[PDB]
Structure formats: structure tokens, C-alpha cells
Design a protein around this ligand. Structure first.
Ligand SMILES: [Cl-]
Ligand SMILES: [Cl-]
Length: 129
């Protein structure tokens, strides 16, 4: 599923990401835009051989199991394919664990390089929500 911007904002808010670990909704929408272009089916291989999955490009080195990332943890205890669903519940539950790991949203490199410090409220502009 390719979410619309406000469509994704409402889903994320319903699932409790707005102000989760102090990060406003616009931060999460901005991260999803640059990680996946709002596409739940996005997958991208990393140079270390792990893969990033879904709307928030959650990585198989630590968070989900894809069976092809040697030395991997599965801290969200979920198959990585479950992060590609049209329902974002699993991705959000897993993202809450990631953002609680110590470095906040800097865990998403695209958030640090493209969202951090910017006017992230623009990402929820016009949304009813
Ligand atoms: Cl915001
Ligand atoms: Cl923080």
C-alpha cells in the first residue's frame, strides 16, 4: 500500500506515535516519506547484507527476522515480511522499540539527515487529524 500523507499521519496517530518518546507526528511522517515514500512494500538491501523493510525501513540486523542476515537479532520478534503489510501495526510497535533504544530517531539515518531540525510540522499540514 502506498499511503497518502494525511492517511499515514492519521494511522500513526491512532497507533500512538504522536509524541512517542517526545517525537511529534510530523517527525514520523517525515521519516516515512524519506525512508519508504509511504510505501508499505518497500525493501532495500544494506551494504552489511541486512535488509530494511516497510514504511519505516526497519532493519533485519537487529529488529526482525528475514532468515538471511547472519548474526541477527529479532528484537521485535516478528518476521520481516510482517512489516510490509497494508496494516502498519507491526511496523509501529517495532518502531516504538527502536526509538526507545537510546539514540531516539537518529536510528533512522534518513530522519537524521533530512528531517532532524527541519519544519516537520509541514508534513501534517492540512490534515484533519
Ligand atoms: Cl509535527
Ligand atoms: Cl530523544
Amino acid at each position: 500500500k502506498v499511503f497518502g500523507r494525511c492517511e499515514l499521519a492519521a494511522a500513526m496517530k491512532r497507533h500512538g506515535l504522536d509524541n512517542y518518546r517526545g517525537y511529534s507526528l510530523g517527525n514520523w511522517v517525515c521519516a516515512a516519506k524519506f525512508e519508504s515514500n509511504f510505501n508499505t512494500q518497500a525493501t532495500n538491501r544494506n551494504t552489511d547484507g541486512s535488509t530494511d523493510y516497510g514504511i519505516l525501513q526497519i532493519n533485519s540486523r537487529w529488529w526482525c527476522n528475514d532468515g538471511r542476515t547472519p548474526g541477527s537479532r529479532n528484537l521485535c520478534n516478528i518476521p520481516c515480511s510482517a512489516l510490509l503489510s497494508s496494516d502498519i501495526t507491526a511496523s509501529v510497535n517495532c518502531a516504538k522499540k527502536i526509538v526507545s533504544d537510546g539514540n531516539g530517531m537518529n536510528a533512522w539515518v534518513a530522519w537524521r539527515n533530512r528531517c532532524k531540525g527541519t519544519d516537520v510540522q509541514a508534513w501534517i499540514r492540512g490534515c484533519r487529524l
